[PDB]
Structure formats: C-alpha cells, structure tokens
Write a protein that binds this ligand. Structure first.
Ligand SMILES: Nc1ncnc2c1ncn2[C@@H]1O[C@H](CSCC[C@H](N)C(=O)O)[C@@H](O)[C@H]1O
Ligand SMILES: Nc1ncnc2c1ncn2[C@@H]1O[C@H](CSCC[C@H](N)C(=O)O)[C@@H](O)[C@H]1O
Ligand SMILES: Nc1ccc2ncccc2c1
Ligand SMILES: Nc1ccc2ncccc2c1
Lengths: 257, 268
C-alpha cells in the first residue's frame, strides 16, 4: 500500500492518457474503447438517478464525461491528496491543469448528440460538487460523516480496486466495501486492468492483483450484483509500452440486487 | 454599360482588407461560437455537411472561389475530392492560408471548426484526421478575379473544368451591383463542368462589412435575386435555404440581415 505515497500524478497521466495510449484518433485504441463502453451504457437510459460517486478517481476525469448528463450530484474521490489537488486544478480551470479536451471532444463525438466539448466540460465541472478522501480497504471507504449523499444511485470505478489489492480476496473485500455506498437496485460501472501485476507512476512501482474476466464476474456475483454486461478489450502490441504489464481491459456493468 | 469603374473601386477597397480583423469579426466568437446550434457558424457547417452527405456531390476536382483566409468551407468537402484548388484576389489572404497549410502556430486556429464538422458528419472522425486530409487534398492556392471572363487567367494551373465549385461570401462582397454579381456568377460557371455542382453561400441584403481599416461595399441581394441569377447562369437549383441573422449576432461588423445557401447543378 505504502507504495502509493510515491505516486506521481503527472507521470501516471503521461503514461496512460498521453500518446500513444492517449491518441483518440484511432478507433481501435484503448482510449476510444473505454469511452465507448461508458457512452453506450448511459445511452441505454437505464443508468440514472440523482447522485453518483466515482471510486478512486485519481487525477482523471474522462470516466465521468458521459456520466455527467445523467447525474446532477457527482462525488469524486481518491486516497491521495496529490490526486485530489490535480482534480481540483482541472475542475477549477486552474493553471497547470491537465488538458482533457480531446477526451471531451471524443465523448461528444461518440454520444452523437451534437454537443460541443466545452458544454460537456462545463456540465461536468458543474455537477462535481466535491472531491473527497477515500480508502476502499475501510468498511466505510468514505468514513463516518461524509459530505457525500448516501446511498448513491450509481457508482463508477476505473483501475482502482485491482490496483489497491494484493490478491483476489482483498479485491473481493474492497468491492464489498464500496458496494455499501451503493443503494439497492443501483448501478456500478467498473473498469480495470486484466491480468496486470504492476504499473509505474514515476518513482512509484505499484503492485496489482492479476484478475481475469471470469474472476471479475464471480467477484461481482459474490458481492450482490447481477452482471448486466461485461466486455473485454485486448491490449494491442503497440500500446504495450513499458509502463505496466496489463494484458487487457475489462468493462463491467453491474446492478446491485 | 461598362464594368471597369466599379471593379476598380472594389479592387481599391480590398487593398486595405485585413485578414486578421476579418477572421476575428466572423470566425471568432460570438459568430464563431460553435456551441449554440442556432448560431450561423453551425448552420453554415450544417448546410455543407448535409449536402455532401447526400453522396450526390462527388468527383475528382473542386475549386473554392474567393477562399479568403478561411478553410471551414472545405471541411466536409475534403472527403469527397482528391484535388482541391483554393483561390483569392489578395496575396495576404493566400499567405494566411499558406500559414495554415504549413501547420504554423501563427496560423489561425480552425480546430473548433474541424471538430464541429467531425461532430455533425457523424463518423467518429477525430479533428486532426480531418485537418490532415484537407491539408493533403489542397493542391494549390491561386490568385483569382471573378470579374475576368477567365477568373483564373489563361492557361491556369487548375484542372479545368472542375467537378464542383464552392464559394462563400465572395460574389456579393466584390460586386458593385447585381449585373456585376450576375456576370461574376457567369464567369465562375465557365470553370465548372456540365452536370457539376456549385455550393454557394453568402450574405443577404448586405451593403457593407468591415475588415479592419477597410470598409467594403456589398451589393444587397435577396434570395429571389440569388435564385434567378443561378437560373440565368444555366443551373438547376436543387436547394436554396435562408438563415435569418439573429439580433445578438449583428455586431456592427456589417449590416447582413441573413445568409443564403444554394446547392445548384450546372445544366448540361
Ligand atoms: N487504499 C485505497 N482506497 C481507495 N483508492 C486508492 C487506495 N490506494 C490508492 N488509490 C487510488 O487508486 C487509483 C488507481 S489509478 C487512478 C484510476 C483512475 N480512476 C482512472 O480511471 O485512470 C489512484 O488514484 C490511487 O491513488
Ligand atoms: N475581384 C475578385 N474576384 C474573386 N475574389 C475576390 C475579388 N476581390 C476580393 N475577393 C475576395 O473575396 C473575399 C470576400 S470574404 C469571404 C472569405 C471566405 N470565403 C469566407 O467564407 O469567410 C475576400 O477574401 C476577398 O479578397
Ligand atoms: N494501470 C492502468 C490504468 C489505466 C489503464 N487504461 C487503459 C489501459 C491500461 C491501463 C492501465
Ligand atoms: N461579410 C460576411 C462574411 C461572412 C459571414 N458569415 C456569416 C454571417 C455573416 C457574414 C458576413
């Protein structure tokens, strides 16, 4: 765990969200795939409500671009202060903010509603009410008197759980922990690395539990979800860059029962 | 009577035309605000996009008539033509384009327009790809004078005759009056092959617009005057639509009351 105290936000953003993995121009890349999964799911009109919490946001906002038009109250979270500050810099249009515009643009493209990317960002910035500390290893990840409206109508979490868990069972428990934040009948969108064991964030080398699609499925079932959808993206050779050993990416749409 | 005097006045007036001020006036916000779907920028792009989306306007060669310092008018066109000719009377506009072609930072930024075009064409094309393709398909930037019987001159570089023409806010902006406008339409029609297409966009009932120090005189035209001229020139009008300029978009940079878009096909 303590490895996360060397985690450099800018290095992680560079490693994953700048070219080559950050090139959205190629439709077969991982960036467009992730956005596509997010957009298609909300376009169904079945993931809706008032409040949403993003679990382990890190310094990234892309995972909420499509979500933001279905939820008026959004809570972003991370274990690290540096990440929350990086988020704050973008949410407040402060200096040095990461440029997410290509992603906003592509979400607008994919969604096909004719929306300009600036409106999309305006709405996202406006519906994120708070950026809060969080530790999924804790039975109450948000703590006791959290400002976050609970229970949430929906959850999003991308590349958090497996990346904070030494093994399957720890992964399963963290899942159990965040699931308590979710209202019954609510929805979870879970995104994560498949069969990954490490990734780099500057000086930080993080351990990851290698999970499979079937393991992810079973974990959700054991937690009280019906899996509405689970798709896999296989990482092409050209996006295997030395920043990690991720083999593929899973997308899960789960509904708490 | 005789065309020299007015054409002389026009040529004289454009010696003061400032591309940057014009770019700022029409293509930066508020008129350059692509977020409001009711705005004129989105309408113009939408007219182009929808027309090319029919699949009915295709071929090898396209000529843009009176390009000025702008490229937006070719964003949807560029996927349908291998060879694109851009053109203008003023060297300064041609250099402006040269600055965009070379992908210089000093160039005017059209990326909002590229993105919006990508957005409305609905193929999930990224804007850098659209731009890269426009830059590849523009084979030449030429001097042009629409008042000349041979607008491009004698033995021009352009592959003649073209399969399609585009022209935005040129003819009316350089014609002291209607007969001048008609003659200009007639002159550019000689560049188009029979059965070919002209996409014509322009200001309605405009008598002046500003380009820095230069204050240019425009012949005020109606939709019906536009239609008749096209018929008069040997076209069938396939589409003619009108945008009424919203009050909030009348900014003192001109007295334009509306914009027209004509899709016309040359009889032959
Ligand atoms: N014990 C813990 N509980 C909850 N989140 C944690 C955690 N330890 C580390 N994290 C956060 O988990 C994130 C993994 S990477 C950020 C993923 C981001 N959501 C995106 O989609 O790319 C990091 O931000 C990290 O700081
Ligand atoms: N005699 C002439 N023949 C052809 N084009 C001319 C001309 N005199 C001026 N022009 C060009 O007509 C343009 C009018 S402004 C329109 C520019 C651009 N097509 C747009 O859509 O914004 C200017 O670029 C001007 O220099
Ligand atoms: N460790 C990570 C985090 C995010 C990713 N997104 C796409 C592909 C691989 C990824 C690895
Ligand atoms: N003189 C001009 C040139 C371009 C325009 N585009 C939209 C509206 C008015 C316009 C006037």
């Amino acid at each position: 765990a303590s490895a996360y105290q060397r985690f450099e936000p800018r290095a992680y953003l560079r490693n994953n969200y700048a070219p080559p993995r950050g090139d959205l121009c190629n439709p077969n890349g991982v960036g467009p795939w992730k956005l596509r999964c997010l957009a298609q799911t909300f376009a169904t009109g079945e993931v809706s409500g008032r409040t949403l919490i993003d679990i382990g946001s890190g310094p990234t906002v892309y995972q909420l671009l499509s979500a933001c038009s279905h939820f008026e109250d959004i809570t972003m979270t991370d274990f690290l202060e540096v990440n929350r500050q990086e988020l704050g810099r973008w949410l407040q249009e402060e200096p040095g903010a990461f440029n997410w515009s290509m992603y906003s643009q592509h979400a607008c493209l994919i969604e096909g509603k004719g929306e300009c990317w600036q409106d999309k960002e305006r709405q996202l910035r406006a519906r994120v009410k708070r950026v809060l500390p969080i530790d999924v290893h804790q039975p109450q990840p948000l703590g006791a008197g959290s400002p976050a409206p609970l229970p949430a109508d929906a959850l999003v979490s991308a590349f958090c759980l497996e990346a904070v868990s030494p093994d399957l069972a720890s992964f399963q428990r963290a899942l159990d922990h965040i699931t308590t934040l979710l209202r019954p009948g609510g929805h979870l969108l879970l995104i994560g690395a498949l069969e990954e064991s490490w990734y780099l964030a500057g000086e930080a080398r993080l351990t990851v539990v290698p999970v499979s699609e079937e393991e992810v499925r079973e974990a959700l079932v054991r937690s009280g979800y019906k899996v509405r959808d689970l798709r896999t993206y296989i990482m092409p050779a050209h996006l295997q860059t030395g920043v990690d050993d991720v083999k593929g990416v899973f997308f899960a749409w789960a509904q708490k029962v």
